Structure formats: C-alpha cells, structure tokens
Amino acid sequence: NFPRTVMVNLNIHNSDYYNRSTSPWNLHRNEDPERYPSVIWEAQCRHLGCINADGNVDYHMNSVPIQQEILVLRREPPHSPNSFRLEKILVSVGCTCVTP
Amino acid sequence: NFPRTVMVNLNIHRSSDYYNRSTSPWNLHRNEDPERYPSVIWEAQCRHLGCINADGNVDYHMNSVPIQQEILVLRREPPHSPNSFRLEKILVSVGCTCVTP
Ligand SMILES: CC1(C)SCCN[C@H]1C(=O)NCc1cccc(C(=O)N[C@H](C(=O)Nc2ccccc2)C2CCCCC2)c1
C-alpha cells in the first residue's frame, strides 16, 4: 500500500425544490474541522410514510433516505492545513419512497 | 485569486439495485473521462416517467425526477498530468424521487 501523493489546487474556477416530493426531506449540516469539506449537509426524511395525492401521509409506504458512498479529505497528519488523505464516507443525498 | 495547493494522498485505507422497491426506481449510467478523478462516474437514470403505486402499475399523474447534486471531481491541470489536479464542480444525478406536478 504505497502512498500516492498528489498536488491539488483547492481554488475552484468554474431539497426545497424537491419539496413537492412524496418523500420530502430536510438538510442537516455536519461539521468536522479535520475534514474537507468541513460542512456536509445530510438529507433527513421529514416523514415515516409517503405523501399521497390527497395531501396526508400514507404510512403503508416508507420514506427512506438515499445513502451513497462518496470521498472526503481527511487531515493526515491531524490538524494539517495542507496535507490530506482522501477517505470513503457514507452520506444521505436524498430521500425516496419505497414499498414494504 | 491566490492559488491554494495542497498535498493529497490518493491511497485510501450496485447502488440502484438496493432501492429497487422505490416508487421512482433508477439505473446507473457510465460516464468515462480520462482527465478526471475519479474516472468513471455512475449517474442515476429514472426508469419511468411516472411513479409506481401500490398496485405495481405506473401512475403518470406523478413524476419520477432525478435528484441532481453538485459534487467535486479532480480535473488534470496541466492536461494529462498524473500528479497535479485542480478540483472542479460538476452536476450529477445521485438518485430519483417522486414529485407532484
Ligand atoms: C456520484 C455518485 C455518488 S451518485 C450515485 C451513483 N454514482 C456515484 C458515483 O459515481 N461516485 C463516484 C464519484 C464520482 C465523482 C466524485 C466523487 C467524490 O467522492 N467527490 C468528492 C466530493 O465532492 N465529496 C463531497 C463531500 C461533502 C459534500 C459534497 C461533496 C470529492 C472527490 C475529490 C476530493 C474532494 C472530494 C465520487
């Protein structure tokens, strides 16, 4: 497992819209100073069931979050403002309605 | 503005088949790009225009839309460089949800 060190220039140079969803969700920020990005919003489902056409909640269905695996930069060594090792974390990118 | 170069150790220590019971199911599509890390990117593609109800049929009174999110990749700068990158912001479909038109 030889380390593949790489230079990266951090200078980039380039849920409320899905509120009509049957399985709506909110955004919860995740702060971690020893990580890039430091702030990660995570999708928290608003209901246990799914909202039907009428408007009320149907609990025969389940509003589950969509958990995906992405990469984040972990400070190696700790508290290093210029040295990172990328790590594989699990986050919720949204919600979807599923059947039992 | 002023460039912000940092050191990144690239040595680390079916996502659509999981949510097949979704009312707004989707598949994964390959997006290949040599000058980008990671190279392969799987984007979610909704399998139906409408959503699936309790009867298993497709209700077109509802719409299954792709959940688009802004993520980061690593663009090669200079081009074809195997050790130097500048991260860019790209837009991908991380899944599908069922909405009401
Ligand atoms: C795209 C999907 C997950 S969607 C579901 C189906 N296909 C997946 C897929 O194909 N994954 C592979 C892939 C493709 C492209 C990029 C990433 C990636 O891990 N980008 C990182 C990132 O941006 N993380 C982040 C942290 C907190 C807030 C927002 C974003 C950055 C990487 C470079 C260093 C810095 C971090 C991964």
Curated annotation (Swiss-Prot), chain A:
Result, substituting R29V: Decreases the affinity for IL17RA by 5-fold
Single GO MF annotation: cytokine activity
Disulfide bond entries: C45-C95, C50-C97
Cell compartments where the protein resides: Secreted
Gene Ontology process terms (BP): adaptive immune response; apoptotic process; cell death; cell-cell signaling; cellular response to interleukin-1; defense response to fungus; defense response to Gram-negative bacterium; defense response to Gram-positive bacterium
Induction: Induced upon differentiation of CD4-positive T cells. Up-regulated by IL23A-IL12B. Up-regulated in peripheral blood mononuclear cells upon West Nile virus infection.
Tissue: Expressed in memory Th17 cells (at protein level).
Principal localisation: secreted
Domain of life: Eukaryota
Function: Effector cytokine of innate and adaptive immune system involved in antimicrobial host defense and maintenance of tissue integrity. Signals via IL17RA-IL17RC heterodimeric receptor complex, triggering homotypic interaction of IL17RA and IL17RC chains with TRAF3IP2 adapter. This leads to downstream TRAF6-mediated activation of NF-kappa-B and MAPkinase pathways ultimately resulting in transcriptional activation of cytokines, chemokines, antimicrobial peptides and matrix metalloproteinases, with potential strong immune inflammation.
Subunit structure, as described in the record: Homodimer. Forms complexes with IL17RA and IL17RC receptors with 2:1 binding stoichiometry: two receptor chains for one interleukin molecule. IL17A homodimer preferentially drives the formation of IL17RA-IL17RC heterodimeric receptor complex. IL17A homodimer adopts an asymmetrical ternary structure with one IL17RA molecule, allowing for high affinity interactions of one IL17A monomer with one IL17RA molecule (via D1 and D2 domains), while disfavoring binding of a second IL17RA molecule on the other IL17A monomer. Heterodimer with IL17F.
Name this protein carries in UniProt: Interleukin-17A
Upper classification of the organism: Eukaryota, Metazoa, Chordata, Craniata, Vertebrata
GN (gene name): IL17A
From Swiss-Prot, chain B:
GO function terms (MF aspect): cytokine activity; protein heterodimerization activity; protein homodimerization activity
Protein name: Interleukin-17A
Organism ancestry: Eukaryota, Metazoa, Chordata, Craniata, Vertebrata
UniProt induction comment: Induced upon differentiation of CD4-positive T cells. Up-regulated by IL23A-IL12B. Up-regulated in peripheral blood mononuclear cells upon West Nile virus infection.
Glycosylated sites: N20
GO cellular component: external side of plasma membrane; extracellular region; extracellular space
Portion held of the full protein: 40 to 149 of 155
Organism expressing this protein natively: Homo sapiens (Human)
Keyword Glycoprotein annotated: yes
GO biological process terms, semicolon-separated: adaptive immune response; apoptotic process; cell death; cell-cell signaling; cellular response to interleukin-1; defense response to fungus; defense response to Gram-negative bacterium; defense response to Gram-positive bacterium
Gene assigned in the entry: IL17A
Protein location: Secreted
Keywords from the UniProt entry: Adaptive immunity, Cytokine, Disulfide bond, Glycoprotein, Immunity, Inflammatory response, Innate immunity, Secreted, Signal
Subunit field text: Homodimer. Forms complexes with IL17RA and IL17RC receptors with 2:1 binding stoichiometry: two receptor chains for one interleukin molecule. IL17A homodimer preferentially drives the formation of IL17RA-IL17RC heterodimeric receptor complex. IL17A homodimer adopts an asymmetrical ternary structure with one IL17RA molecule, allowing for high affinity interactions of one IL17A monomer with one IL17RA molecule (via D1 and D2 domains), while disfavoring binding of a second IL17RA molecule on the other IL17A monomer. Heterodimer with IL17F.
S-S bonds: C46-C96, C51-C98
Recorded family membership: Belongs to the IL-17 family.
Post-translational modification: N-glycosylated. Found both in glycosylated and nonglycosylated forms.
Mutagenesis / variant outcome for changing W42V: Has no effect on the affinity for IL17RA
General function of this protein: Effector cytokine of innate and adaptive immune system involved in antimicrobial host defense and maintenance of tissue integrity. Signals via IL17RA-IL17RC heterodimeric receptor complex, triggering homotypic interaction of IL17RA and IL17RC chains with TRAF3IP2 adapter. This leads to downstream TRAF6-mediated activation of NF-kappa-B and MAPkinase pathways ultimately resulting in transcriptional activation of cytokines, chemokines, antimicrobial peptides and matrix metalloproteinases, with potential strong immune inflammation.
Organs and tissues of expression: Expressed in memory Th17 cells (at protein level).
